Amino acid sequence: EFVPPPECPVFEPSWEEFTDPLSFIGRIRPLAEKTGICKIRPPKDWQPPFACEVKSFRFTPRVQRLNELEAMRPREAFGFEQAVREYTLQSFGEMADNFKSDYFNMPVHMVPTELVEKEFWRLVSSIEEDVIVEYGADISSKDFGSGFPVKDGRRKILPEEEEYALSGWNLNNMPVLEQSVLAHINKVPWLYVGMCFSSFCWHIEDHWSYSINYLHWGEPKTWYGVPSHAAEQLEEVMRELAPELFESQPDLLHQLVTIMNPNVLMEHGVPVYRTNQCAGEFVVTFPRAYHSGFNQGYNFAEAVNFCT
């Protein structure tokens, strides 16, 4: 069965340390950059309201066949394996909980995180079982608003919520402009509505950028991370073991479909760290830190790349 990687570092900054995100990330860097990813729990009283326009929030999630790589005799009428469905936030969550509770035959919050993890990686490599889920991924915060309150005049902000619209940990307030000469001669957060087994495969950010990720609410998001000093070793393991049909593809295109069990990387000398990102917690990925993961259940996340 799947062997869980060691836990990545978790930081619980004081109110004084929480005053500056870039300053705090710079101070934890000597440890966190050696693990690729880290988790940051804000102070207990720091609780931002959910500011998405929930009434009109509608989306068509992408279909994810967990064993699509392992399944590579073509199936009859391949390409039409799933009917397309549009959801609201409510109807997607009702579908999400029904799937997980039917799959494990128990209430969604009673399923151990270790069990969903072991089942996810078994299904990914299983040919005898075709599990298909949906992921509301890469939803632009410009469509229905950010999960954080923002002072843009498009939605009401209560006085007790103004501190969160101005907070440096509001992902809409992270610095995103990279310095360059072209910037003298010449990005918003993305949203992720997850369900059980919805996943994102191994990748690094464009320009080897940092990324910060916040889980607004819902069941945990399980992460795996690799430190940047082992980036070449992971890419070598990919070249050796990933499907040879995709071997010559550029990294940007390869990264779309590169799922790999973390135990395979660990067996080949790649250090891997895990964490369960719970509601209200941050996850920071450092430059060129390969990361991947899946969702334990119905949740809502927001992510953006930032510059230092």
Ligand X SMILES: O=C(O)c1ccnc2cc([C@@H](OCC3CCC(F)(F)CC3)c3ccccc3Cl)[nH]c12
| Residue 88 interacts with which of Mn ion, ligand X, none, CB < 5 to 8 Å by class | none
Nearer to Mn ion, 131 or 137 (CB): 137
| Residue 92 interacts with which of ligand X, Mn ion, none, CB < 5 to 8 Å by class | none
| Residue 301 interacts with which of Mn ion, ligand X, none, CB < 5 to 8 Å by class | ligand X
What residues line the site for ligand X (CB under 6 A)?
135, 137-138, 192, 200-201, 203, 205-206, 213, 221, 255-256, 301, 303
Least distance from C-beta 279 to ligand X, angstroms? 13
User: Rounded CA gap, 69 and 154, in Å?
Assistant: 43
Q: Cβ neighbours of residue 264 under 8 Å, at least 6 residues apart? A: 237, 241
What residues line the site for Mn ion (CB under 5 A)?
211
User: Rounded CA gap, 230 and 200, in Å?
Assistant: 20
Q: Is position 221 annotated in a ligand binding site?
A: yes
User: Rounded CA gap, 32 and 229, in Å?
Assistant: 12
Query: What strand order describes the sheet that includes 291-295?
Result: 199-203, 291-295, 221-225, 273-277
**Secondary structure of residue 147 in the 3-state scheme:** coil
Q: How many residues does the chain have?
A: 308
DSSP string for 71-87: T--PPTTTT-SS----E
Nearer to Mn ion, 211 or 258 (CB): 211
Q: What's the DSSP call for residue 262?
A: H
Least distance from C-beta 22 to ligand X, angstroms? 19
Nearer to ligand X, 100 or 221 (CB): 221
Least distance from C-beta 157 to Mn ion, angstroms? 29
Nearer to Mn ion, 243 or 287 (CB): 287
User: Rounded CA gap, 94 and 142, in Å?
Assistant: 25
DSSP string for 184-199: HH----EEEEE-TT-E
Position of minimal CB gap to Mn ion: 211
Q: Is position 205 annotated in a ligand binding site?
A: yes
Nearer to ligand X, 144 or 210 (CB): 210
Binding site listing: 135, 203, 205, 211, 213, 221, 291
Binding site listing for 2-oxoglutarate: 135, 211, 213, 221
Binding site listing for Fe cation: 203, 205, 291
